Design a protein around this ligand. Structure first.
Ligand SMILES: CC(=O)N[C@@H]1[C@@H](O)[C@H](O[C@@H]2O[C@H](CO)[C@@H](O[C@@H]3O[C@H](CO)[C@@H](O[C@@H]4O[C@H](CO)[C@@H](O)[C@H](O)[C@H]4NC(C)=O)[C@H](O)[C@H]3NC(C)=O)[C@H](O)[C@H]2NC(C)=O)[C@@H](CO)O[C@H]1O
Ligand SMILES: CC(=O)N[C@@H]1[C@@H](O)[C@H](O[C@@H]2O[C@H](CO)[C@@H](O[C@@H]3O[C@H](CO)[C@@H](O[C@@H]4O[C@H](CO)[C@@H](O)[C@H](O)[C@H]4NC(C)=O)[C@H](O)[C@H]3NC(C)=O)[C@H](O)[C@H]2NC(C)=O)[C@@H](CO)O[C@H]1O
Ligand SMILES: CC(=O)N[C@@H]1[C@@H](O)[C@H](O[C@@H]2O[C@H](CO)[C@@H](O[C@@H]3O[C@H](CO)[C@@H](O[C@@H]4O[C@H](CO)[C@@H](O)[C@H](O)[C@H]4NC(C)=O)[C@H](O)[C@H]3NC(C)=O)[C@H](O)[C@H]2NC(C)=O)[C@@H](CO)O[C@H]1O
Lengths: 341, 341, 341
C-alpha cells in the first residue's frame, strides 16, 4: 500500500518569491510622493496544481493546470484565488506539439515579458505605452493556443486566438489573434511576433490594433549574453484617427560562477497621431541588477532602476489617457528571493 | 519513513472541466446580442480538500471538506477561493447515516440540479422562474443536513434546515427548511422533495415560499434510460398576494458501448397571481447532446440547446422582476471535457 | 520510486474549525436585533502550505508559508484566497532564531490574541476600544519580524517593523514598530510588549499611537492555570488632542483528565481625552466555556458569553467613531469543533 510518484493524479508546484522594494517618486505633488513611495513587500509567491492523463480512448495526452495568483503583492491587499494565473486544459502529441484552452499568455506577450521586460523594465515595455485601443492582451482568458514542436530542432511556432476583455463578461464583441515564431541559429535565437485586436471599445470609439515585433537573443561561451527587441504598435479608430508608436528594449548580462550582473534599458518613443508627433509622450527605464545563484532551485538579487515616464496626453474623448506614467516618475531599490519547487 | 495512503490526513481531489460554448442571442437589441453572444470558454475546473478522522473519544467518524469554486467560468473573471463550493464538517455512523454543518446542497436543489437540470436545462429549471420570494436556496451556507442510510436497500431521506441569504450577513431573519425522499423500485427511482422559505424580503414585502416536487428515473437494460420531474412553487406575500407557478423537466438517454445520446426538455408554465394567469410568463428549453466515454475518469461531449424565455413581468413593487430571461432568448452550441481525480 | 516525507518540498496543513453560534442582540432597534441576531455557522476552517529549504550556498535555513483565510465565517460570504492569513518567507539559524518577511502577527497582537482574547473576549479586548488612531495593527502585511531563540531556556524576544494599511496600497506613509518579551520563571510566564504607530490618518487628523502591555500566565500542577493582562493605549493627534484608554483581560481554567472549564472576563475602561473622562465609553465581557479533548488532534466546546459595549462617542471630526459596539450589546451561546492536521 506504499505510495509512489504515480499514485498521485496531480502535482503541487510553486514559485516562492519576495521583493523588498523601496520607491522614491517624483510626481510633482509631495503628498502623492509619500503615499506611493516608501518601502513595501512584494510577495509574488504562488501555488499551482497540474497533471497529465493518458485517456484510454484518445491518443493525444490530456493536460491541465490551475495556478494561483500572487498572494500579497505590493500596492495590493492579501489573498489570491486558484486560477488567477495560467489555468487551462489541453492536449499534446509528439508530432504536432500542444494545444491549450483557457487562460494563457498571448504569443506576443510571452516575448514582451521574457526576455524583454526583465529586470524592472515592464512599466515601460510591458504595460507602458500611450497608444489607444489595446496594444496586446497579456495573460488572457478565453484563449485557444497552439505551441508547435521544435521542427528540425531549429524552428517553432506559437499561435493563438481568443476573446476580449469585455467579451469574457458578455459586455462586448472584442477579440484578437496572434502568432509568434522562434529560430535557433548557432548561439542565437531570432524571435518574431504579431498580434491583432479588434472591436476594442475605448474613448467613445471602436479600435483595431496591430502590433509587430522582432528581436534577438545571444549567448557567448564565456558567460556573456544579451537581448534586443523592437516593437511597433499601430491603432486605428472608428472615426478615422490613426496612431503609431514604437519602442525598444535591450539587456546585457554577464554570468560568472554563481553570479549574474545585468544591465537593461527600455523605452517607448514619442507617439504619433494622424502623422503629428506628440511632444513628451515617450518613456524610458534603466536598471541594474546583481543576482546570486544561492541554490539550483533559488536566487537572491539586488536591483536599482530609474523610470522616466511621459508627461501626459489626451485620448480621443478629450480626457487624460491613463498610461504607466499617470502616477509619476520614480526610482526603486529592491532586494529579493525566488525559490522553485 | 516510507509514506502510505494513511500518512495523509487530507486528500486533494478535482473536477477538471472545460466547455467551449458559442451563444447566439435574440434579445431584440442588436448590440446586446453581440455583447452576450459569441464564443467563450467556461472553465468550471475546481480543486478541493477532504478527510476523515476517527476521534479517540467519539464513535461517529469525523468528516470534512473544503472545495474551491470554478476557476474561470464564462461571463466571469478568473480566480476562485477555497470554500465557494461544498464546504463542511460533519459526522457519520453506520446506523444513522451522516450529518453535515456548513455549505451544502438543499435536499430539493440536489434533485433539481441532478437529474433535472442536465444537459443545459438549468436556465429554465434550476434558477429560471417568475415567482416572487425565494423558490428554494441552492448551495447554501449556514445549513445543517442529515443524509439517512439506505434503509432496507430501498429507501432514504435527506433533511436540512439553514439560514437565509440576508441572515448569513446579519442583514435579516430569513430561513428555510426542507426534506427529500428516495425509493428504489426494481429499475426505478422515485423522488420527492419539499422546501419552505420564510422571512424572505423582496419587492417591498416579506414572503413565504413553499415548493414541492416529485419525479421518476428509469433504466431499461438495453442502454435506454430517462427521467421526468414535476415542480410546484407557491409564494405568499405579507400584503396578501398569492402566486403559483409550476414547471416540468424530462430527459431521454441511450447509452451504448462508449457513447451516450441525450435529449432533454424543460419548461416553466405561465405564472399565476391571485388566480389570474399572466400571459407569456413561461419559458422552455430543448437540448441535444452526444457524449463519449473517453476514459473511465473522463468524458468529451457536444451539445446544442435552445432557450425561449418569458417576455417579462413586474414584481409587486411595480418594477421588472429579474428572471433568467431578462438577458433574452438564446441558442448555444458547445463542446466540452470533464476529468475526475 | 516509493515516496518518503522528504520527496515533498511542501506540506499541506490545516485547522478545520466550525462554530454553531446563536446571538441575541439588544441594540435598541428590534429589526436590527433580528438581522444581526439568530443562529449562524462560523466556518473558520483554513488550509495552508509551508516548507523549509537548505540552500547550498547560504547557511541560515530558508522558510516559507502561505495560509488561506477562513473559508465561510459568520457575518460573511463563502470563499477565501491563498495568502489571507500568515504568509511569509524567512530565514532561521540556531544562534539567532528567525526572521520573517511578509504577513505576520505584530509582537503585541500575538499576546493580545493569545492568551488574552480567549474565549470570546475579542470584541472587547482584540479589536474593541474607543481610542483614535490605530491602537496596534494585528495580522499585518509588509512586515519584517525577528523571533529570538529562548536564551538560557528562560528568555526571548519578538521584534518587528512594518508598513501601514494605507502604505501597503500607496495611499499613505503610515508605519509602525514594536517589540515583545517573554520570561519563564518556574511555572510562570511574564510578558511585556510595546507598539508604536505613526502617520495614521483618521478623522481629519494625523495620529501617533503608543500602546504598552504586561501580563502573567501561571500553571499550578493540579490542572489549575490562569492569565491576566493589562494594556495601556495612548494616542496623540496633529491638532494637539491627547487620548488615553486602558483595559484588562483575565482568564481562569481548570483542566482535569479530558475536560477544561474556562472562565474569562475582559474590559476596556472609560476613555479619557485631554484629561476629561467620557461617560460610558467602557465595555466588558464575561464568558464561560466547557471544552472536551475529543482526540489528541481535536476539541469540542460549548460556550456562553455576554458583551456589554459602550454606548457611543464622537471622533475628532464631529462624527460617530465606529467601535466594536456600534452594532449593540449582545449575548451568545455557541458549540464548536476544531481539528488540526
Ligand atoms: C523580480 C523578478 O525577477 N521577477 C520575475 C517576474 O517579475 C516574472 O513575471 C512578471 O513579474 C512582473 C513583476 O512586477 C509582473 O508585473 C506586473 O505585470 C502586470 C501585467 O499583467 C501589471 O498589470 C498592469 O498594471 C496596471 C496596474 O496599476 C494596469 O493599469 C495595467 O493595465 C495592467 N494590465 C492590464 C492588461 O490591464 C502589474 O501592475 C505589474 N506589477 C507591478 C505594477 O508592480 C508581470 O506580470 C509578470 N509576468 C509573467 C508573464 O509571469 C516571472 C516570470 O513568470 O519571473 C520572475 O523571476
Ligand atoms: C455542465 C455539465 O456538463 N455537467 C454537470 C455540471 O454542470 C454540474 O454542476 C452544475 O453545472 C452548471 C453548469 O452551468 C451550474 O450552473 C450555474 O448554477 C448557478 C446556481 O446558483 C447559477 O447561479 C444563478 O445565476 C444567475 C446569473 O447567471 C443569478 O442571477 C442567480 O440569481 C444565481 N443564483 C442565486 C443568486 O441563487 C449560475 O449562474 C450557473 N452557471 C452559468 C450561468 O453559467 C450548476 O449550478 C451546477 N450544479 C452543481 C450542483 O454544482 C456538476 C455538479 O457536480 O455535475 C455535472 O454532471
Ligand atoms: C475560538 C477558539 O476556540 N479558538 C481559537 C481561535 O478563535 C483563534 O483565532 C481567533 O478566533 C476568533 C474567533 O473564534 C477570531 O475573531 C475574529 O478576529 C478578527 C481580527 O482580525 C475580527 O476582525 C475585526 O472584525 C470586525 C467585523 O465586524 C471589524 O469591524 C474589525 O475592525 C476587524 N479587524 C480589523 C483589523 O479591522 C473578526 O471579526 C473576528 N470574528 C468575529 C467577529 O466573528 C480571531 O481573529 C482569531 N485569532 C487570530 C486570527 O489570531 C485561533 C488563532 O490561531 O486559534 C484558536 O486557538
Amino acid at each position: 500500500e506504499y505510495l509512489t510518484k504515480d499514485s498521485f493524479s496531480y502535482e503541487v508546484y510553486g514559485i516562492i518569491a519576495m521583493q523588498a522594494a523601496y520607491r522614491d517618486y517624483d510626481s510633482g505633488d509631495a503628498k502623492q510622493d509619500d503615499n506611493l513611495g516608501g518601502m513595501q513587500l512584494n510577495n509574488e509567491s504562488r501555488i499551482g496544481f497540474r497533471g497529465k492523463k493518458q485517456f484510454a480512448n484518445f491518443e493525444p495526452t490530456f493536460i491541465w493546470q490551475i495556478e494561483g495568483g500572487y498572494v500579497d503583492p505590493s500596492f495590493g491587499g492579501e489573498g489570491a484565488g486558484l486560477g488567477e494565473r495560467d489555468t487551462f486544459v489541453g492536449f499534446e502529441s509528439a508530432s504536432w506539439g500542444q494545444v491549450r484552452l483557457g487562460r494563457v499568455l498571448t504569443p506576443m506577450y510571452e516575448l514582451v515579458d521574457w526576455p524583454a521586460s526583465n529586470p524592472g523594465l515592464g512599466d515601460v515595455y510591458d504595460w507602458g505605452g500611450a497608444i489607444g485601443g489595446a496594444k496586446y492582451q497579456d495573460r488572457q482568458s478565453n484563449t485557444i493556443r497552439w505551441d508547435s514542436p521544435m521542427y528540425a530542432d531549429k524552428f517553432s511556432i506559437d499561435a493563438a486566438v481568443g476573446a476580449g476583455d469585455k467579451a469574457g463578461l458578455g459586455a462586448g464583441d472584442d477579440y484578437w489573434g496572434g502568432i509568434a515564431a522562434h529560430y535557433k541559429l548557432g548561439p542565437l535565437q531570432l524571435d518574431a511576433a504579431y498580434e491583432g485586436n479588434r472591436n476594442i471599445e475605448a474613448e467613445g470609439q471602436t479600435w483595431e490594433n496591430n502590433t509587430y515585433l522582432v528581436g534577438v537573443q545571444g549567448w557567448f561561451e564565456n558567460g556573456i549574453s544579451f537581448f534586443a527587441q523592437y516593437k511597433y504598435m499601430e491603432a486605428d479608430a472608428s472615426n478615422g484617427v490613426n496612431e503609431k508608436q514604437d519602442a525598444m528594449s535591450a539587456g546585457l548580462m554577464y554570468t560568472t560562477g554563481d553570479w549574474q550582473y545585468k544591465l537593461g534599458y527600455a523605452a517607448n518613443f514619442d507617439l504619433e497621431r494622424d502623422g503629428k508627433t506628440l511632444s513628451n509622450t515617450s518613456d524610458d527605464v534603466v536598471s541594474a541588477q546583481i543576482m546570486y545563484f544561492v541554490d539550483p532551485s533559488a536566487v537572491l538579487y539586488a536591483r536599482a532602476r530609474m523610470n522616466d515616464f511621459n508627461e501626459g496626453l489626451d485620448g480621443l474623448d478629450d480626457a487624460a489617457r491613463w498610461t504607466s506614467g499617470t502616477n509619476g516618475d520614480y526610482n526603486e531599490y529592491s532586494v529579493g528571493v525566488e525559490y522553485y519547487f
